Amino acid sequence: DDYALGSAMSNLASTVISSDVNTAQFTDCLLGGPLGGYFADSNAGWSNTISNFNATNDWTRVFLISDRIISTLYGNLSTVKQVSENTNNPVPYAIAQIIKVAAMSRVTDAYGPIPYSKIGQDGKITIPYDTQEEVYNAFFKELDESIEVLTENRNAALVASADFVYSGNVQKWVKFANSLKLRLAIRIANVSPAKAKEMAESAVNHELGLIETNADNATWKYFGTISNPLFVAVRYNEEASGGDTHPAADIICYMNGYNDNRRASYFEESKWPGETYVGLRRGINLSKMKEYFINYSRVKISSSDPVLWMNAAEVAFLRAEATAIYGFNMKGTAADFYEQGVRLSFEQWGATGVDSYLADESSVPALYKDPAGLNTYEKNLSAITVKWNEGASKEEKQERIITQKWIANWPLGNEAWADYRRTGYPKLLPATSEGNLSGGIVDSEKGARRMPYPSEEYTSNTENVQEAVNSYLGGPDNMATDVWWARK
Amino acid sequence: DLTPDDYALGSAMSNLASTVISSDVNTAQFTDCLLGGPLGGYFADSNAGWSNTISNFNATNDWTRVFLISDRIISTLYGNLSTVKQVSENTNNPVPYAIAQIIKVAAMSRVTDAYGPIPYSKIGQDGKITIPYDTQEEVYNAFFKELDESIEVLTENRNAALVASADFVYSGNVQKWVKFANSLKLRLAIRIANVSPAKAKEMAESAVNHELGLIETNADNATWKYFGTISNPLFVAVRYNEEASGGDTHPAADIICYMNGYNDNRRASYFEESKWPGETYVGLRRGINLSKMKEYFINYSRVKISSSDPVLWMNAAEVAFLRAEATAIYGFNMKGTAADFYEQGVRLSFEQWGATGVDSYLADESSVPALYKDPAGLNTYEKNLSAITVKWNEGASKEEKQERIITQKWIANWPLGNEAWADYRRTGYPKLLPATSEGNLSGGIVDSEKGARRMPYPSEEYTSNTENVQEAVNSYLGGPDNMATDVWWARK
Ligand SMILES: [Zn+2]
Ligand SMILES: [Zn+2]
Ligand SMILES: [Zn+2]
Ligand SMILES: [Zn+2]
Ligand SMILES: [Zn+2]
Ligand SMILES: [Zn+2]
Incomplete structure (x- = not known):
């Protein structure tokens, strides 16, 4: 029962979806959720948002700039590495590297090329960027190292207090690593088919398998005394608006049409007469909706709920698409x-x-x-x-798979956003004419394809970010330019 | 345009399917109601007039010989295999014979698992068994070879199909047939895992490595969906003499004791409620003095079954439990x-x-x-x-892990008595009740705690195939030709 490893492991876990309410709000409530078709902004006072395509730098930079993500990640990786190397026990660092990939995949998937391989001990990003392809190659290398080490030590364990995902169960960590490996393989399947095949098939061939049961879902079970950050974020300003974030029209339209029995688990009922479930439209004129936000269905969530990273359903849908x-x-x-x-x-x-x-x-x-x-x-x-x-x-098979995968991935907005950009599915609603505040840059039917790089990087890392834009990005540094694995 | 081989094929494929569990009521009664069911711990005999039974270990030859002698099994199997082979070879279409060979293994595995050494490789076109026997090991090696051939061929032709009318198991779906072949391969691999571990490993791991996988969903369970107009044979057999006894066969005490203790919600799907006050589910004990129970049989729980039900060969649950045991x-x-x-x-x-x-x-x-x-x-x-x-x-x-796996596999395999019997003999699980002192009519040959380990060879074979059956007994069986001698994969 060590505080230092324990504190480090929790710090690492927090770099996926933060326990800090405002950080999680930015990464998953205001960015992932809406861009993935799950959530819709609902605060009349917001004149600049990601969903309206006119977001200020403080909204868009968070993945790459927040101290609670990269700096925290690499600072704590270093701590766990020391523990492993000085106790001759490779298990903790192997698990830490898996969490690293879970965290940083979301970062590269948001911007495209990013600093990664050249990020040193200090966690500073003032260095040359990797191409998104190089980043993904490193992800695969890192996951494979962790899988090999943990499989050699399959009967070892972390202390429960050092792991509120799997309570120190090493085999479940291997399953998550193979599962994450499969997710990332399918991510690159259009642009890098031979690599995707190798990584996808390798994942499924491993002696310990993937996440196949809901008992092994990757969820961070950190809350109850500490409040779930998504709970707090979506409930902000409840009394006036019903919440800063509502469920999106898109998800509810699909589920209503299918008479989907999962609706009762996802949403709270609307106050609109005759309509149990009504979602709020994304990419709209917010000021005009001030008086009406409160009537829409809300996110069903509790302050003690775990935060989802990946479920068994996604693994099945990944295998379905891999084959079909x-x-x-x-x-x-x-x-x-x-x-x-x-x-x-x-x-x-x-x-x-x-x-x-x-x-x-x-x-x-x-x-x-x-x-x-x-x-x-x-x-x-x-x-x-x-x-x-x-x-x-x-x-039709791909649309069918992705649509059900999407419904089943509530509320993993960043993952849904990645799948939407790779595949075009599900067929999400467009922004409205008034709601598209991009000045023409963003196509309402395609939406935001990436986040622009932080202004901080042009100031403090000018040559390197310019290299990324001029050599690696293949388009201007704005929300219209597709990332490498999404380029058609 | 339809040709003779189109018509020949449909009739042949259904004939082959019937060699697993027969649509003939009395044949199915013998193979699965009076033999498999009781020996596997699912069923119990319930006719006071039966002075000689398999469960009491004093069965006459007409009860024990059926797997090896009945025309509805071996003769029908090899006659119809020959037909399908001709169709495949003369239409340059290897799919039908590949499927037929899978059914062959499903049918004949039950036969060797009942007796031990059997005629197999030397059975010619005519379906006669008047030839030298194979060791059980040779029979299993041939099963693996045959399944592997079928799997290879069907996988090369994975987008081909049989016509629906030629297949009331899978409606001609070639990929489901491959899944069943891999699944059957895994069953048989685990069957031999104690006696032939290296072979078992190779076959088990090969099955799960195959690109089309195993039976993983209940939609792909191997069941013969042949009934509705024709009555399910198990239905008719267990319901015989209903008015007097409630049925010739009742659910066994063993299965109901386990499920009652576990408050198992599957009971309502397996059984009809008993007439005994205060006890919804009560099974009948196996290996008992039947005459004394005449007036009481009717009060016990009954087999819940309908005349249109498909007949089960193998389900998705078994595949999971096989993989569980294979690893653990x-x-x-x-x-x-x-x-x-x-x-x-x-x-x-x-x-x-x-x-x-x-x-x-x-x-x-x-x-x-x-x-x-x-x-x-x-x-x-x-x-x-x-x-x-x-x-x-x-x-x-x-x-404990093995007992846990086999016990749940057993409950989930209702009513595949022959498979349960094989698992009981290989593993000793589940811990089935012993025959009673009065109910063991073996004259001391059968151990009440171990039960029947095999069927004795047909008397017909001593008459018409004397030298060959004697060779099997003297060279291959490793014990006397009775119910006490274990088969090769069950030998400790
Ligand atoms: Zn480079
Ligand atoms: Zn598990
Ligand atoms: Zn034809
Ligand atoms: Zn005959
Ligand atoms: Zn599976
Ligand atoms: Zn299927």
Whole structure:
């Protein structure tokens, strides 16, 4: 029962989704959530937001600049490394490296090229950037090292107090490492198919497997005495608006159309007459909605809830896409993996009626008729249905997999955003004409493709950030330019 | 445009399927109601008029010979294999024969598992067994070779299909057939894991490495969906003489004792309620004095079954439990963990039968199998059954882990008596009740605590194939031709 390792491990865990409310608000409530189609901003006082594409630097820089992310990560990695090397015990540092990848994947996925390999002990980013490809190559190398070490020490354990993800269970850490490896492999499957295949198939071939049961979901079980940060953030200003962040129209439209029994687990009911679940539209004129925010459905969440990093459902949907779209050898069939993912999701949230849900070949995502009468979407959403069809086209299979993966990944907005950019699925609603404050830079139908680099970097690391933009980014440093694995 | 081989194929494929568990009521009664069921701990005989049975260990030859002698099994199998082979070879389409060979292994594994050494490799086109026997080891080696051929061919042709009418197991879905072949390969690998560990490892690990995987979902369970117009044969057999006895076969005390003790929500799917006051589920004891029970059979719980039900060959739950044992007991590389596989098997089973409350069930570390207090007051078991509990314990001993896996696999394999019987003989689990003193009519040959270890060879073979069956007994069996001698994979 050591404070120093314990404190370090928790610090590392916090660099994924921070326990600091305002940091988590920025990374996941105001950025990930809306860009991934789960959340919608709901504070009339915000004249500049990420969702409206006119965000100021203090909103966009957080992943790359916040002390609670990179500086904290590398400072604490160094501590755990010392402990491992000075107690001749490689387990703690191997687990720390897995958390490193979980944290920094979100960072590169937000900006594209980033400092990574050249970040020294001190955690400073005043050094040359890596290409996003080099970053991903290092991720794979790092995960493989951790997997090898932990598998050699599969019967070892961390103390429970040093691990509120898995209570020091080394085998679950290996499963998460293989699972994360599969996520990142599929991430690069369009741009780097041979590498993706090798990493995807390697993950599934490992003797300890992936996250296959909800009992092994990667969630940070840190809260109860300390409040869940997402809880506090989305509940801010509750009395006036119902909350600073509401569930998005998109997710609720899909789930309403499918009569999805998971809705009761995701959302609180709206105050709009006749409509149990109503989401708030993203990329809208916020000032006009001041008086109406409070009527929409809200995020169902408790101050003691764990924070999700990755679930068993996603792993099934990854294997489904790996086989069906990319032709990788996943030791199974797409039809099985798709249904297993949906079943795992229903079970995760305690919803019943999955059989009828999986048999539904006629229900489609619902229209968005705005009960406030301000942001009604005049067109139809996708006609993609639930029931697996083996004879369907590749495009339909991919839309089917990603749509269900997306629903099942509530509320992992950053992951949903990455999948939306890689695949184009699910078919998210566009920003409105008034809500797109990009001055023409952002296409309302495509949304934000990345965050711009921090102004701090142009000031203090000028030559290096300019190299990244001129040599690695393949476009201007704005929200319209796609990242490497998303380039079409 | 339809040709003779289109028609020949449909009839042939259904014929082959019927050689696993027959659609003929009396054949199925013998193979699975009177033999498999009781010996596996699922079923119990319940006809006061039967003075000679397999469960009492004094069965006559007409009961014991059926697997090896019945025309509805071997003769039908090899006759129809020959037909499908011709179709494949003369239409340049290897899919039908590859599927047929999988069914062959499903059918004949039950036969060798019943007797030990059997005729196999030397059975010619005509389906006659008047030839030299194979050792059980040679039979299993051939099974693996045959499954591997089928898997290779079907995987090369994974997007091909049989017509639906030629396949009431999988409706011609080639990939499901591969999954069943890999699954059957894993079953047979684990079967031989005590006696042939190196071979078992190779076959088990090979099965799970295959690109199309195993049976993982209940939608892909191997069941023969042949009934509805034709009555399920198990339904008819267990319901025989219903008005007097409630049925010729009742659920066994063993299975109900375990499930009652665990408050198992699958009971409502397995059994009909008893007529005994205060006891919803009560099983009938196996290996008892039947004449004394004449007036009481009707009060026990019954097999819950319908005339249109498919007949089960293998389910997704078993595959999970096989992988659980492969990793935990035998140290094979199953690309996962025993804890996961055990829970997945139990979840698949609950889902298969529409039962809820699996989370609470899997969290139960205190409930134990119940005692057997016979409400008739004749065959009460005075001792305690095993104290094995449900909840997975990673720190438990190997022996406890194996008992835990096999016990849940066994419950989940209702009513695959022949498979349960094989697992009981290989592992000693679950801890089945012994025959009673009065119920053991073996004249001392069968140990009441161990039960029947095999069927004796047919008398027909001593008459018409004397030299060959004598060779099997003297050279291959390693013991006398009776119910006490263990088969090769069960030898300690
Ligand atoms: Zn470079
Ligand atoms: Zn399937
Ligand atoms: Zn034809
Ligand atoms: Zn005959
Ligand atoms: Zn699996
Ligand atoms: Zn697990």
